[PDB]
C-alpha cells in the first residue's frame, strides 16, 4: 500500500522555569523511528526502531545537529508568536509542526506537507501544490508574507519532492522485515447484556499492523452505520494495534447482526456472527 | 532524515 515519513515537533514555553521544552519524533508509516528530548540527558537524536541503527555516526551527528537547530528556531517562534497576538509572558503556549511526504504502492511520490500550529489550532500550512500557503488568521498573514519573501516554499519543494522520499524508500527497504510487514487481526466477539431488553455485541480486532483498519457492523446485510460505537485505534504496546466496534441489539435479534473486518494483512474480508 | 533549513515564523 502507501507509505509515508512524518516528523512531529512540539515546543512548549515555560513562563519562568527554564527554556521551552522541545520534543521531536520521526515516523515511517505507523512506526516511530527517532526521538529527541530537550530534557533528556542525551542531547542527541535517539534510535527508536531496530532498522536505522545501521546508519553511521555521521548520520546521528547530523540529525542531532539539525534537530537542535529546530529547537532554536522554535524557541524564537514562541516569542515572535506572542508578539503577533500580543500575549503576556505569563502563560505558556504551544507551538507544533508536522512535515513529511507520502508515496504510492509503487513508492512514487504523491503528496507533501508542512503544517504549523499555535496553541492547538492551525496557523499556517503549505497547499498541496507545494508553492503557496494558507494562513488561518491575520497573525499568519505575517508569517506567510515573510515566507514567500524568503522563498521558503521553493526551498521545501526540494526536500519534500526528493530528499524526504529518497530517505523514505531507503528506510522502507532497510526495514522490510518490520515495515513491509502486514499482521492480520486476531479477531473475536463479545456479548454482554446491557439493558434489560438488549445486549451489546462488540467486535474485536487485535495485534494487527498497519493501524489502517475497517470494522463494520451489519444487520440483515444492510450495514447499520449509525448505532455503531467505534473506539479510536489504540496501540497494544508491542508495535501492533487494537480496535473494536459495538452495537446494542434487542436481545434475540443477535443472529441477525454481522461484523465485518477489513485489513491489508487479511487475504479476504472477515465477517463474524455471535 | 530531518529537514536542514527551517525559517522562523
Amino acid at each position, epitope marked *: 500500500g502507501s507509505h509515508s515519513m512524518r516528523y512531529f515537533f512540539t515546543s512548549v514555553s515555560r513562563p519562568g522555569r527554564g527554556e521551552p521544552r522541545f520534543i521531536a519524533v520521526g515516523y515511517v508509516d505507523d512506526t516511530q523511528f527517532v526521538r529527541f528530548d530537550s530534557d533528556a540527558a542525551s542531547q542527541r537524536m535517539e534510535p527508536r526502531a531496530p532498522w536505522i541503527e545501521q546508519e553511521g555516526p555521521e548520520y546521528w551527528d547530523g540529525e542531532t545537529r539539525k534537530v537542535k*537547530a529546530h529547537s532554536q528556531t522554535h524557541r524564537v517562534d514562541l516569542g515572535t508568536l506572542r508578539g503577533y497576538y500580543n500575549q503576556s509572558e505569563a502563560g505558556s503556549h504551544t507551538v507544533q509542526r508536522m512535515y513529511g511526504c507520502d508515496v504510492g504502492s509503487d513508492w512514487r511520490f504523491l503528496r507533501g506537507y508542512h503544517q504549523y500550529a499555535y496553541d492547538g489550532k492551525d496557523y499556517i500550512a503549505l497547499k498541496e501544490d507545494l508553492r503557496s500557503w494558507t494562513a488561518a488568521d491575520m497573525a499568519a498573514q505575517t508569517t506567510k508574507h515573510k515566507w514567500e519573501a524568503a522563498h521558503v516554499a*521553493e*526551498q521545501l519543494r526540494a526536500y519534500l519532492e526528493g530528499t524526504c522520499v529518497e530517505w523514505l524508500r531507503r528506510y522502507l527497504e532497510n526495514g522490510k522485515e518490520t515495515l513491509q510487514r502486514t499482521d492480520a487481526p486476531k479477531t473475536h466477539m463479545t456479548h454482554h447484556a446491557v439493558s434489560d431488553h438488549e445486549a451489546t455485541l462488540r467486535c474485536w480486532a487485535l495485534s494487527f499492523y498497519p493501524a489502517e483498519i475497517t470494522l463494520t457492523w451489519q444487520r440483515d446485510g444492510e450495514d447499520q452505520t449509525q448505532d455503531t460505537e467505534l473506539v479510536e485505534t489504540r496501540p497494544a504496546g508491542d508495535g501492533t494495534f487494537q480496535k473494536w466496534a459495538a452495537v446494542v441489539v434487542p436481545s434475540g435479534q443477535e443472529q441477525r447482526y454481522t461484523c465485518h473486518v477489513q485489513h491489508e494483512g487479511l487475504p479476504k474480508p472477515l465477517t463474524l456472527r455471535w | 532524515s530531518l529537514l536542514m533549513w527551517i525559517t*522562523q515564523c
Partner: T-cell receptor
Amino acid sequence: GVTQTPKFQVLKTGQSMTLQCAQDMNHEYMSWYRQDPGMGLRLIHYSVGAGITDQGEVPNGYNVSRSTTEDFPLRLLSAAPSQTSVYFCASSYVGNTGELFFGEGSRLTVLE
Amino acid sequence: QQVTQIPAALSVPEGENLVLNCSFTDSAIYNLQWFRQDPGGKLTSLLLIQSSQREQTSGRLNASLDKSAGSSTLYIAASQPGDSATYLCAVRPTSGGSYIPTFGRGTSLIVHP
C-alpha cells in the same frame, strides 16, 4: 547587527582573553573565524543554538559557549604568538535567506 | 565542495564593465553569497542568491546563479577605482547538517584610475 569587541588587542603569551560577539537578529547560527594576512577564513567554532557548540577547522587554544541566543563569546585559554591574527564573528539564520553577517573584526597580537 | 574563482587576479581601467567568476563542485547548495574585502578592512556582503533564484542586483552590482552547472558570475557596471578589492563567493550546503559555508580564495580586482 553583529558587533565584536574589542577591535584591537595586544596580549603577552599566557593571558586569557575573551572576544565577545553579539547579534540582535535572533540568528540561531553564530561562527568564529581567524584570517591570517591574506590567507583565507579558517573556521574555529560554530553553533546552531543555545546550549550547543561544535568544532571547526582550528579549535585549538579556543573555547566557546552559547548560553544565550545573542552572545557567542570566544575565549583563548592561554595566549600564544601563533594565535596573533584577525578574528571574525559571523551569524545567520539557520533558514530564511541564510545570509551571513560578519562582525567588524578583531585584531589580536600576542607578544612574548 | 570546492569553490574556484579564476582569473585569480583582475586588472582593468575605470569605466569598463567587468566579470568575476565563481565555480563550485557540489550543486546541492542553499545559497551563494558575494563579499568584498579590502586589506585591513572587514568583509562586506554584496549580494545573496538563494538556490531557488537567478539574477540578483544592487546598484552597479549584478550577479547570476547557474546552480545546475555549478557557476556564478558577478557583474560590475562602470568600474570605479573604489571597486578595487578582493571579491569572494561562498556557498552553503543544501544538506549535510552543518550549515558551515565554503569560501573560495577570491579574485584580486584592481580598477586603475
